[PDB]
Amino acid sequence: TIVTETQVIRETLWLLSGVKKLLIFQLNDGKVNVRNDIIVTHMTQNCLRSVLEQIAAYGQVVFRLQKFIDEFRTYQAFMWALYKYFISFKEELTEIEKCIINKDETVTLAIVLDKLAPRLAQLKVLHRVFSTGIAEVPPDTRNVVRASHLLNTLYKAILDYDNVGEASEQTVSLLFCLWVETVRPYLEIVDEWIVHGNLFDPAKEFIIQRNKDVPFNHRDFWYATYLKPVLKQIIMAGKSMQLLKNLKCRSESVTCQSFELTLRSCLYPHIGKQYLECCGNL
Amino acid sequence: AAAAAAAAAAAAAAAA
Amino acid sequence: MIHELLLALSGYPGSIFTWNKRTGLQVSQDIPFLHPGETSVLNRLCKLGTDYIRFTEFIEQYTGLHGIYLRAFCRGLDSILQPYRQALLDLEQEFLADPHLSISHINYSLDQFHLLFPSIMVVVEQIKSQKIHGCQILETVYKHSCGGLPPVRSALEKTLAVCHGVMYKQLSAWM
Amino acid sequence: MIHELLLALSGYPGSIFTWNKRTGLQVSQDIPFLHPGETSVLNRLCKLGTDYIRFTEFIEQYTGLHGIYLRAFCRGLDSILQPYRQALLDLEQEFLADPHLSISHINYSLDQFHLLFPSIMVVVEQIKSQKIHGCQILETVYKHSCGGLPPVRSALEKTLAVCHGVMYKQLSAWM
Amino acid sequence: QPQLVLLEETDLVKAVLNVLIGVVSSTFSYNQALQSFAVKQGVYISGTSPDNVSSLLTQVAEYGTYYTRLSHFSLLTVLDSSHSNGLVFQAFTSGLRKYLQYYRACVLSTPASLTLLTISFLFRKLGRQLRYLAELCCAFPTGVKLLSYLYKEALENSSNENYPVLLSLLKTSCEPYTRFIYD
């Protein structure tokens, strides 16, 4: 039969916004396929049907990324880094939608395919972070070792992708979007663990593996798994501030090179300016 | 001082 | 159909989107001038107007169980509809500068509300299923503001801050 | 048949030009509306689309052996498809101003690519048959940019210049 | 049930303006038997956006219904048209009439209206207030008992825009009683 040519691509551009539909059979997360029909024996035989099988995989990841969204903060901020990035993906979506509603449009199947092509590479590196992210959720006893090895694979992904590229810093910032935001609740417990003396660790999952023991003679026991000296400076300081609350006393990217271990070696004196000033008070 | 350490990191990125 | 969707978003009924009051909906899409794709997004756009009238019933029950912190929680919730309703009037001048713009920008503003409106709806549903009364709404919202979602964690801290002010009233008058 | 040949040039399959993926081709010319001369040039036009998908497999293997200069060589190769794909969209408006123009101008633009596309395909075939790893791709491309063909010698100098920038990164951070 | 084709949107923003002050428009019919406003039932205008003003305009006509009760109550208790109400009962109205001109100065500034949401959301805070401020007296407390009802209602804070207006009503209604104290 005849389906609408140059309008089914505006109707997949439809699907990519509102993700569950009837022109495209994305029934589940594992299988996302499209079937329109075979179209007629003149005027674009099968090329357009080959292009729809490509974008079937590109609506597949956004259905996977939305299925990851449900309604620690580290697992929630890693989820909101996905969603805060979506409005930068949804702004172009309204641009090409504004172009085709405005007559004349002067676009077709193929001349739009290079406009979303820089976005096409940006959405596939989104797939690699989240596919290497969740791999041990159907296994049980995930709690801290899943958090530790998905932060590890996030760090494994930023070593593989930023350090090899650097011709475009727009994706260099993008892999830093996924890093600086997940580490921020993993930071704000450390701020609470020093200047307030107490920390928050939930019971269903676990984080940095700091826990206070219930007896008074026991100080602090580090959980065994079943920069690191700067983390030991957090351990002794939060022990010492737990003591102190018990005591009653009285431009261009290529010149900025590169990138995340320089910012981390800025955070360690930021830890340091409290690790150096606590031990003076002890 | 949570985002403040990251704000100085982004300030050091523009000055690097 | 610019005005039909801002006003399906405010929560009032129609006869294309037939609505009785405050709980029930029939979609009624035998419509000729919308596409089968475009009614699916109106169901996506109605789900952000459904929880907005699941919200005014929580107002009129408490304003106009019992407790002095139930309506202290009400002037927390009016602040979360206030940039919502501020966004409702900025869409109005969008329909006057050019009344030919289609619905995807209105879809775009409501994907921004897509992670604020269910995330507070799961809060009030967890509130009403424990049958909470008194200070322990303030502890329920405190472990709800224990969560992330950085726009939403400030929002459940603003609802925390206003009923902490009624706590702040109490030990001021008691002393 | 204006759109059928730009899109046989992008590398995607058909059932007149049946293609499995990325390595294999059947010509399948029992065609009534092309001449025996005109299928011979479609085989001349497919040979410039065959090496273009012998090229994206070299991308997806390295982007999305091992080494930090393999994908440094990848942002060299995207610059050689960039006026290629720029030429793909200038043929699009050619088919809209008058949709009666025959295929010989499209043959003419692809005789311009006829000395850029094999001359880089002989480079990557010599790359993968020595099993190169590290800095010695940069020396392989340096004696490939030792060659002439003045459009192509600038092209293998642009692929040289981008992975020399990753060399330029190294001794900057080391010092 | 169908009545006729649509009116205009600019006729809607003027009809909501009349029902707020207590005056019937072409679409509003005041019914004395229920002391309520009545919009027409069907396809007459009902919403240029289908059947939406048919419910939204009833929410603001009901919001317009409580205002004509307060002006009805204020005219019937004055001691130039009655001689059976108390002085403390009169002094509660004297603070109420100062609240009425604040309503009149605010309803006169609503032009130019854009749509029906921009006016009802401006009066959404005022919608909670008028619903309170009418049915506190509608029971029927009089004099010192009415003075006892209003002090309890000024005691009901956790409201911060309803507390100072009842504080002001306590300041005005206690003026004749405190005059009988010092003499």
Side-chain angles (χ1 to χ4, degrees):
Chain A
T1 193
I2 315 180
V3 292
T4 61
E5 298 161 357
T6 73
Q7 279 309 314
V8 285
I9 197 179
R10 196 206 73 91
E11 282 197 56
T12 183
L13 283 189
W14 206 252
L15 157 83
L16 263 301
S17 320
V19 281
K20 85 158 189 58
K21 279 300 291 304
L22 320 171
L23 193 149
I24 296 100
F25 299 150
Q26 40 174 25
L27 305 170
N28 52 309
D29 204 0
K31 292 189 57 53
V32 171
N33 54 345
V34 190
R35 194 56 194 140
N36 277 10
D37 205 65
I38 174 160
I39 52 185
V40 309
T41 62
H42 188 232
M43 287 303 298
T44 75
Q45 309 300 101
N46 200 14
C47 50
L48 178 145
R49 303 192 274 150
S50 307
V51 167
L52 318 175
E53 284 143 30
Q54 296 147 216
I55 192 159
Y58 298 109
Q60 186 174 359
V61 54
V62 193
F63 186 78
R64 180 149 290 169
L65 293 171
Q66 192 172 277
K67 194 57 68 177
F68 184 81
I69 312 284
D70 45 17
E71 282 82 53
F72 203 50
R73 303 185 283 272
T74 286
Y75 197 55
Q76 300 321 109
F78 184 48
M79 200 178 66
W80 183 83
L82 183 49
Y83 209 95
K84 179 54 194 58
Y85 179 75
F86 277 140
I87 59 168
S88 310
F89 172 55
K90 287 287 291 194
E91 61 93 3
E92 59 84 16
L93 178 136
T94 45
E95 192 268 330
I96 181 58
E97 186 50 55
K98 271 202 287 192
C99 180
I100 196 161
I101 192 58
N102 166 247
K103 313 297 184 297
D104 58 335
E105 69 275 15
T106 71
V107 294
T108 183
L109 173 83
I111 202 176
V112 68
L113 276 169
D114 52 339
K115 291 155 190 149
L116 80 168
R119 282 299 170 182
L120 170 147
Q122 288 171 72
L123 62 91
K124 183 178 179 180
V125 289
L126 277 194
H127 173 278
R128 179 62 175 163
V129 174
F130 272 102
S131 58
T132 317
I134 46 162
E136 296 274 275
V137 167
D140 58 336
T141 298
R142 315 142 195 79
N143 47 7
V144 51
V145 60
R146 173 213 35 77
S148 313
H149 78 250
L150 167 158
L151 265 296
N152 182 251
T153 56
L154 185 133
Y155 189 40
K156 192 280 202 175
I158 199 177
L159 264 290
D160 198 33
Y161 284 177
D162 188 356
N163 297 271
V164 80
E166 294 155 354
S168 85
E169 53 258 36
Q170 198 54 49
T171 65
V172 172
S173 285
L174 202 163
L175 273 299
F176 159 85
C177 300
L178 299 169
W179 189 91
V180 70
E181 192 186 295
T182 313
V183 170
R184 175 182 272 97
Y186 210 89
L187 205 158
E188 80 197 351
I189 53 165
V190 167
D191 199 298
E192 199 175 14
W193 173 229
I194 305 177
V195 302
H196 302 116
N198 47 359
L199 76 162
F200 181 71
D201 205 327
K204 44 165 81 173
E205 61 90 37
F206 276 93
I207 48 184
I208 209 178
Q209 300 274 258
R210 187 78 273 142
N211 188 25
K212 197 147 301 291
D213 215 349
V214 294
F216 174 67
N217 48 6
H218 196 289
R219 311 141 298 159
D220 211 0
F221 68 109
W222 168 269
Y223 278 138
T225 61
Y226 61 97
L227 185 49
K228 311 307 150 203
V230 187
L231 316 182
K232 303 215 184 172
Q233 289 167 170
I234 304 176
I235 289 169
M236 60 79 53
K239 280 180 56 183
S240 76
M241 297 299 292
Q242 183 263 357
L243 293 174
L244 286 187
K245 70 184 283 293
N246 298 0
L247 290 107
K248 185 65 171 61
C249 318
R250 296 173 192 86
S251 61
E252 182 59 43
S253 159
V254 78
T255 195
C256 182
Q257 293 288 102
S258 91
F259 273 114
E260 58 276 350
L261 72 164
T262 74
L263 312 184
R264 273 190 303 258
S265 63
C266 201
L267 295 192
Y268 310 143
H270 297 345
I271 298 307
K273 78 213 177 189
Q274 175 74 247
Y275 157 70
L276 271 301
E277 78 192 347
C278 62
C279 307
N281 304 332
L282 267 298
Chain C
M1 54 300 294
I2 43 189
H3 202 30
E4 286 77 347
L5 280 63
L6 209 152
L7 282 176
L9 169 56
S10 50
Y12 309 123
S15 352
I16 300 308
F17 48 107
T18 82
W19 182 278
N20 71 286
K21 210 181 191 305
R22 93 181 55 240
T23 180
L25 167 81
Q26 283 310 299
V27 290
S28 177
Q29 314 287 316
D30 201 25
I31 192 155
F33 62 102
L34 276 299
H35 287 90
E38 304 199 283
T39 149
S40 67
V41 55
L42 260 153
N43 298 318
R44 300 285 72 70
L45 292 167
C46 173
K47 89 205 177 195
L48 292 145
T50 306
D51 49 8
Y52 177 58
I53 194 171
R54 287 269 176 93
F55 206 93
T56 71
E57 55 197 56
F58 204 62
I59 289 156
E60 66 91 17
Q61 171 73 62
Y62 293 172
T63 313
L65 300 179
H66 56 268
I68 74 176
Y69 301 107
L70 285 191
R71 204 169 137 190
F73 188 78
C74 292
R75 288 179 178 81
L77 28 90
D78 56 28
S79 8
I80 204 53
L81 314 174
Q82 181 61 255
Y84 178 62
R85 291 184 299 257
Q86 177 54 48
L88 297 180
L89 59 93
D90 270 353
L91 296 160
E92 190 34 51
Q93 47 93 27
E94 170 71 42
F95 307 149
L96 175 42
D98 212 356
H100 206 289
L101 269 264
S102 194
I103 74 178
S104 300
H105 183 213
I106 300 96
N107 301 355
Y108 175 76
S109 177
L110 267 76
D111 299 315
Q112 163 270 307
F113 289 118
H114 191 252
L115 185 86
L116 184 50
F117 264 70
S119 62
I120 193 67
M121 177 265 275
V122 63
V123 163
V124 279
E125 177 54 43
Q126 205 272 340
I127 279 163
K128 288 296 296 191
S129 178
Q130 210 263 317
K131 288 90 191 173
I132 320 182
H133 198 291
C135 218
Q136 42 271 51
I137 296 84
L138 194 141
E139 204 60 36
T140 289
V141 77
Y142 180 82
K143 305 279 98 176
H144 278 124
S145 53
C146 178
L149 287 77
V152 184
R153 86 181 75 182
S154 65
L156 291 290
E157 197 265 339
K158 296 320 282 168
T159 64
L160 181 69
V162 56
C163 59
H164 209 189
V166 187
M167 294 298 303
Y168 175 80
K169 180 190 196 306
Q170 206 143 35
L171 97 177
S172 68
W174 180 241
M175 283 305 305
Chain D
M1 54 300 294
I2 43 189
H3 202 30
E4 286 77 347
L5 280 63
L6 209 152
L7 282 176
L9 169 56
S10 50
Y12 309 123
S15 352
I16 300 308
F17 48 106
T18 82
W19 182 278
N20 71 286
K21 210 181 191 305
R22 93 181 55 240
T23 180
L25 167 81
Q26 283 310 299
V27 290
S28 177
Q29 314 287 316
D30 201 25
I31 192 155
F33 62 102
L34 276 299
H35 287 90
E38 304 199 283
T39 149
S40 67
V41 55
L42 260 153
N43 298 318
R44 300 285 72 70
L45 292 167
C46 173
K47 89 205 177 195
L48 292 145
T50 305
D51 49 8
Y52 177 58
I53 194 171
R54 287 269 176 93
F55 206 94
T56 71
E57 55 197 56
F58 204 62
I59 289 156
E60 66 91 17
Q61 171 72 62
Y62 293 172
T63 313
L65 300 179
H66 56 268
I68 74 176
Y69 301 107
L70 285 191
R71 204 169 137 190
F73 188 78
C74 292
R75 288 179 178 81
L77 28 90
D78 56 28
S79 8
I80 204 53
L81 314 174
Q82 181 61 255
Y84 178 62
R85 291 184 299 257
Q86 177 54 48
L88 297 180
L89 59 93
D90 270 353
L91 296 160
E92 190 34 51
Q93 47 93 27
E94 170 71 42
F95 307 149
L96 175 42
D98 212 356
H100 206 289
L101 269 264
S102 194
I103 74 178
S104 300
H105 183 213
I106 300 96
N107 301 355
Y108 175 76
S109 177
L110 267 76
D111 299 315
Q112 163 270 307
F113 290 118
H114 191 252
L115 185 86
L116 184 50
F117 265 70
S119 62
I120 193 67
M121 177 265 275
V122 63
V123 163
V124 279
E125 177 54 43
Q126 205 272 340
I127 279 163
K128 288 296 296 191
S129 178
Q130 210 263 317
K131 288 90 191 173
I132 320 182
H133 198 290
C135 218
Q136 42 271 51
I137 296 84
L138 194 141
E139 204 60 36
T140 289
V141 77
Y142 180 82
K143 305 279 98 176
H144 278 124
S145 53
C146 178
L149 287 77
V152 184
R153 86 181 75 182
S154 65
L156 291 290
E157 197 265 339
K158 296 320 282 168
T159 64
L160 181 69
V162 56
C163 59
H164 209 189
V166 187
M167 294 298 303
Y168 175 80
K169 180 190 196 306
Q170 206 143 35
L171 97 177
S172 68
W174 180 241
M175 283 305 305
Chain E
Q1 178 71 24
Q3 290 194 107
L4 80 171
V5 62
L6 308 171
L7 298 180
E8 310 303 292
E9 279 98 325
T10 44
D11 293 354
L12 300 185
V13 303
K14 297 186 183 71
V16 60
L17 187 50
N18 286 25
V19 72
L20 279 181
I21 201 61
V23 174
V24 291
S25 74
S26 293
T27 177
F28 286 121
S29 167
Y30 191 78
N31 192 10
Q32 196 64 61
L34 300 173
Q35 286 187 224
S36 167
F37 278 99
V39 76
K40 325 290 193 215
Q41 56 93 30
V43 163
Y44 172 79
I45 177 70
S46 77
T48 60
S49 311
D51 206 66
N52 219 46
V53 164
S54 61
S55 44
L56 161 59
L57 207 53
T58 55
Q59 298 313 118
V60 67
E62 192 47 60
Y63 172 51
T65 296
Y66 294 112
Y67 186 65
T68 179
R69 312 187 201 179
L70 273 186
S71 47
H72 211 311
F73 177 79
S74 64
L75 290 175
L76 264 288
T77 180
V78 72
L79 287 194
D80 308 310
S81 307
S82 164
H83 286 283
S84 81
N85 293 4
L87 311 171
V88 185
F89 200 86
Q90 184 194 177
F92 159 71
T93 309
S94 62
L96 174 64
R97 276 178 278 195
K98 300 309 289 183
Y99 178 74
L100 293 175
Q101 62 176 244
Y102 166 72
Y103 198 100
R104 290 192 185 96
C106 203
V107 71
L108 213 60
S109 186
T110 79
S113 162
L114 306 100
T115 184
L116 280 75
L117 299 171
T118 67
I119 308 309
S120 52
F121 294 157
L122 180 57
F123 290 142
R124 181 170 165 103
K125 173 179 81 164
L126 275 296
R128 287 169 184 90
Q129 189 166 61
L130 172 74
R131 282 190 297 188
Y132 210 103
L133 263 296
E135 293 205 336
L136 58 91
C137 201
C138 302
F140 295 91
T142 47
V144 61
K145 186 201 166 217
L146 181 72
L147 195 50
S148 300
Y149 202 100
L150 65 89
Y151 183 50
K152 178 254 158 174
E153 286 306 353
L155 274 162
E156 291 290 327
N157 50 11
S158 279
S159 68
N160 292 321
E161 73 272 15
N162 190 32
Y163 165 61
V165 55
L166 290 154
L167 175 141
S168 306
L169 281 160
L170 175 73
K171 188 165 51 174
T172 44
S173 186
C174 275
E175 284 183 86
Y177 188 80
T178 49
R179 267 198 179 173
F180 302 145
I181 294 296
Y182 68 92
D183 50 34

